[PDB]
């Protein structure tokens, strides 16, 4: 249920220390990873311009 997931998240956060410390550590990792993936996909996209994406088919 919805209460069960909220308690599971709470326990997961307390497992590694103060809840706010664990949560911020995870977000710190996730934010760096998502910007890293965005940078990589941008380099991937500019490296292949001969696919004519802008013609919608």
């Amino acid at each position: 249920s919805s209460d069960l997931q909220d308690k599971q998240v709470e326990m997961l956060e307390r497992k590694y220390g103060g809840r706010l410390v664990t949560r911020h550590a995870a977000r710190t990792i996730q934010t760096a990873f998502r910007q890293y993936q965005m940078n990589k996909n941008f380099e991937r996209l500019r490296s292949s311009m001969s696919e004519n994406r802008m013609s919608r088919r």
């Binding site: 997961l12 220390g17 995870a26 977000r27 710190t28 990792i29 760096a32 990873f33």
Partner: protein, 113 residues
Amino acid sequence: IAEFKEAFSLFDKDGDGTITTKELGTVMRSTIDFPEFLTMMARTDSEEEIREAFRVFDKDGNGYISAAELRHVMTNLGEKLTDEEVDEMIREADIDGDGQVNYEEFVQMMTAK
């Protein structure tokens, strides 16, 4: 040391321990009181913060994190990653393939300028 107290005092024209907010920028490039200003002077790079963040999840100070554990945290806490995002993370972060994530290597992999 208090070399910043002398630049503050130069803008403290009536000697009441305050500098104007108009010159607040002019002072740094060289009402707000001194306790406030000594804070703005004392007031970490991305590499270190990310290492510390991973260290929170390495409870035993081992230098690695289980792939199943990293997945559990990444998909359930904070900005919840997707499973395919975590698959990409583990592919590059599990250097040996045993299911243990060398996060110190991964940190530099990410912040590789």
